[PDB]
Amino acid sequence: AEAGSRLLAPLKKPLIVSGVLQALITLIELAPFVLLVELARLLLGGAEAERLWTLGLTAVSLIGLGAVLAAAMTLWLHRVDARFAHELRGRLLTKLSRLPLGWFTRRGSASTKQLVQDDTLALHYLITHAIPDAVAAVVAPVAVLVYLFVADWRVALVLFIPVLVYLVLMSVMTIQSGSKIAQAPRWAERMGGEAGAFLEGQPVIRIFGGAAASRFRRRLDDYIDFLVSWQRPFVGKKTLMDLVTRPATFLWIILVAGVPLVVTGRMDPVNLLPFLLLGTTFGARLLGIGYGLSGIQTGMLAARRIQTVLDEPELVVRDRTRPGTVELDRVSFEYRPGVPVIRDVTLTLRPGTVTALVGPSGSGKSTLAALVARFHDVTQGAIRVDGRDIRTLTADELYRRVGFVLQDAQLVHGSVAENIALAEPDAGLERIRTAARDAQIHDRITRMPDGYDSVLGAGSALSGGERQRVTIARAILADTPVLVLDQATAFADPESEYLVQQAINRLTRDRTVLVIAHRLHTITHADQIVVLDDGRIVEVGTHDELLAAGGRYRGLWDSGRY
Amino acid sequence: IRTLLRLVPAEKRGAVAGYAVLTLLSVLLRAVGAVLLIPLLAALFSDTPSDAWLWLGWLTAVTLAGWVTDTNTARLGFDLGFAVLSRTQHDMADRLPNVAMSWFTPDNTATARQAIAATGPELAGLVVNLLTPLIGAALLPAAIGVALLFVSVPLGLAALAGVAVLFGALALSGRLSRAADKVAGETNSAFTERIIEFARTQQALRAARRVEPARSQVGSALAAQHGAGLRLLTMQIPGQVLFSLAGQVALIGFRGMAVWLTVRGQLGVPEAIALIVVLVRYLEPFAAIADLAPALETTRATLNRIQAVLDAPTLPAGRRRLDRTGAAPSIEFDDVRFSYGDEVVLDGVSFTLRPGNTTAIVGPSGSGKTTILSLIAGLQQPASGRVLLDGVDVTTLDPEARRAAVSVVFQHPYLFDGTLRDNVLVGDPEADPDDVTAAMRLARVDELLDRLPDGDATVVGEGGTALSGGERQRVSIARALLKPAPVLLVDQATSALDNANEAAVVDALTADPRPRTRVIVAHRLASIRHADRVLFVEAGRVVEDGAIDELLAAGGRFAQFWAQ
């Protein structure tokens, strides 16, 4: 795999070092068994006590050294491949912060979690155990079999029965489980998304259908059936491999092939000692890769899936590198190919000018605000903030010019201060309280038990109007030259809406504002009202001019007043 | 193992008895096969090799029986693991809709997400992957030590002394790494929740310059996760060291006893040669158990999560059923007091709603007017009071009849990832296509179908994010209207809908054919157009009620509400 090899390129030296060290360690671990073979031969030969004690103590010390070496190598390799995993997760979190925001909506939060966390964890066997286990399985069986051939060829060839049976079982196991491992991450993402929606959309599940009439349970049954189908023959093959390559099976085969040779005048009983002592040792090492090829397949697929994300388009700042001005120019945008949501929209804000964007629902005003935010790049045209194009402004220099209030009030898990001070965490508590008072939320927060330190996670949230006021407080505290209000004060009652609108007008007397609202009675004082219909501006003007014109805005006004 | 046995179905406990019996039998067979070498080699190496045929035959019988019992134990272990998986996951799916809303704290929601997300093969094949090898390795050296009594009592009793140190090393290895593993799991769960939050609210983080790992919450979570993981890897060295020391000390004890027996002449030289192989077999489980300590700890964590989810407190419920399946049930509040923690939300709210009318609830944000609809729908329940549907307390109603008697338009219209028709169809999935089309027509969703390329097959994203706010609101309204529930609630009517769509949907809600009791919450006078009854709630108490025109004439707080 090109992507798999290119992702783990830094670990070439550690992987080769681990391979060589395990080639040495398997020989060191096989060393004391040869010493015990010599000890058994001397016991049958009746050697003096000194030779027996020296061989026994050397064998004990050598097996101890082999165990210590294996533990040290696995410790070091786990440390190296925890550092690699942390670095790769950091790289992924730096990548995802630059992808076009259409990447997140079509993938979901559960898929992003599977990417950053589960896929990078799936690399564990490929980098910590794959090469040591492969080298051990190709060294220790080969060296042991070569030695046992010199000891006796008749009793060595019979050990190819369990070895060849194991090879056939391993090959058919991996061939049958190849497709299911490929299908597994898709099912993991699907199940994660279903679980996330099940927990997040709990009221909908409770009222509309309940527990039994839910999609989550249906796909849960489907996933459990898939897991059964995948894991039944898989574990069936694993246990058969364990039986084929366990020490007792090798020992029984050795004895069945040897006792006919020893009882008959065909073999000396002393030549069974190599087979009894060494011949049972390489079974457990063969099984290490038998249980590892599945881990290697998952690791390689996870490596490919991670590197695919690291090769995405990244909203790169281009090399083409008035205050308070935003200036669209023949902007056209499509969330998907062949699906135009904006059509030749030209619009220029100015300092101290409150531009009002209204129109039918689904027209394209929120996506226009997103384009101003550069969550997505305009397909055509250009958006120029202070003359500089947004595609040349870096993110720090861009979002320090433009502050936003989103339609969806998205609070993050943290204190109320941590949400009001999301943009400027260094901001003092008095600045936070001033912003909150301007947003008509400080009265609410003081009534909560902990005050501003109270957490705003799931299950400790607020009402819709209160969280929208919190987001308004965030945008006010950010204090950017340009402000965008995507449907702010939708859930606010008239009194609170009037108060926060007055606060915003006070806080943007000289700054730029782009108010977006379906409640047209608040829009009547706007400097210019831009009617966005079908993703294209159909008319521009003040309130009175638009009413006199008698077009879309007159229709919306008449529908509202009734 | 105590936390696992309670989770097995009562159907499968016969299979659990079979599994335990076959596990003990397989371990005894393996230990017999290990110690059957000593008679075998003693007869083979002696002057009469023909006396080895009997022990070879017995070894063949024992190893064939071991293979049979091991395949059967594998089948039973797989079946038990997947049966536990299926029952636990189904119980979590069936219980969570009944769990109280207060239970879904951020940490409890994280635990519930992790427990459901633990449905993969790591937990499904738990018995075969963990319990079978762990018990086999734990009982094999004791089984060999017992079996060595037949060969020699003192040697066998010396070998069993190597199992006491094995259990001591196991307990020490678990208890030394208990803290670091718990902190590792804590940090990993925090990182999972922070990744989900980071991917879920990318807009607000990006606009706030809080996305890159040097400045973001996910970055700090990843750094803490890395620190905890490295600490855990450092802290698992004592477990490996203790297991290695225990294996070595068992080797020393076995070797000393065997040398004593051979020197005293009670043990032949070929018997000692066979005992070398038996010692190699005896020592191998010491390494196998040392491999399974992290797996055992992770399994313990996952089962604790699953049991925590299964232990959650369900809402109080009864077994009544509403008298009027189709007709409009009168909705009544009588001293309904509700509170979030120590915060009082409603204090003595009492209002009687006529059946079949259209009721309006209006007031300042933070008043409690969504909590009233939550209580009417049964999502919440009063702290001290009784919400009655047609004279019947909702707390006493069967859950099925409870959810079949109310339809709600939620303030924040969550939609599941899927086609638009799948989101509308959930209101009444058995409904005919005519009813679905009428529901979409009333809620003005026909504008979406003519606009979007795919019509009603268009795929919505995570939540309703792949549609505009007003469009997903209209899909939610269509979903609510599709249901035949006699009671219709609206937490926020047409918040994100323009004036034309708002007026059309407002007309459609009152103009639906069948009779219903309609309660609607609004922050604009156009959306309470021709409401039969009005309620004004300011601080969790209905300040005044009556007709719209009556309240306007009275000049009360409702009249000045819209003056601005």
Ligand SMILES: Nc1ncnc2c1ncn2[C@@H]1O[C@H](COP(=O)(O)OP(=O)(O)OP(=O)(O)O)[C@@H](O)[C@H]1O
């Ligand atoms: N992620 C997305 N993928 C594809 N289409 C999208 C996506 N998000 C929004 N759209 C489309 O964008 C169009 C306009 O959406 P937008 O969010 O701009 O609406 P809007 O004018 O703010 O509406 P409203 O105020 O009624 O919510 C809608 O047709 C919607 O289908």
Ligand SMILES: Nc1ncnc2c1ncn2[C@@H]1O[C@H](COP(=O)(O)OP(=O)(O)OP(=O)(O)O)[C@@H](O)[C@H]1O
């Ligand atoms: N999950 C929660 N945990 C704690 N308090 C909550 C929770 N949800 C709501 N509240 C509190 O309930 C009170 C009333 O909430 P409710 O949802 O009824 O408001 P509302 O009157 O509908 O307002 P809005 O106009 O903002 O939609 C608010 O003070 C809010 O702080």
